[PDB]
Design brief:
Chain lengths: 47, 48
């Protein structure tokens, strides 16, 4: 139309871009703590 | 240097704190290479 949308995809880019923030943030956080934990595994097993 | 486990001596460790008593030596820390090393370090510390 566009609209793009009908709130609910513009305002569910409040979902979609922010579900992309839950996803990109999820990879961010798991990336962080996983990276530092494995860093504390070469610390914790090798070192 | 070997601590190793004691209990010895006096307050059953009496030191037991023990952040290298003061360090982490927290270089930046930011330096995870670890070199696969070594002896630990003869280094004349063995000669010490």
């Amino acid at each position: 139309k566009n609209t793009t949308s009908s709130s609910n995809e513009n305002p569910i880019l409040r979902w979609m871009s922010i579900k992309m923030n839950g996803f990109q943030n999820e990879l961010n956080e798991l990336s962080g703590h996983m990276i530092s934990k494995i860093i504390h595994s070469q610390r914790l097993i090798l070192q | 240097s070997q601590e190793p486990m004691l209990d010895a001596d006096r307050l059953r460790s009496s030191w037991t704190f023990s952040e290298s008593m003061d360090l982490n030596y927290s270089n930046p820390s930011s330096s995870p290479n670890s070199l696969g090393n070594l002896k630990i370090l003869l280094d004349d510390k063995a000669s010490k």
